[PDB]
């Protein structure tokens, strides 16, 4: 989608 698994760490 757009590096969602990545946004998971951003949080």
Coordinates of C-alpha atoms in Angstrom, one line a residue:
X1 CA 0.0 0.0 0.0
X2 CA 2.5 2.7 1.1
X3 CA 5.0 1.2 3.6
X4 CA 2.2 0.6 6.2
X5 CA 4.2 -2.0 8.1
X6 CA 6.7 0.8 8.2
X7 CA 4.4 3.4 9.6
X8 CA 3.8 0.8 12.4
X9 CA 7.3 1.7 13.8
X10 CA 6.8 5.5 13.3
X11 CA 4.0 5.4 15.9

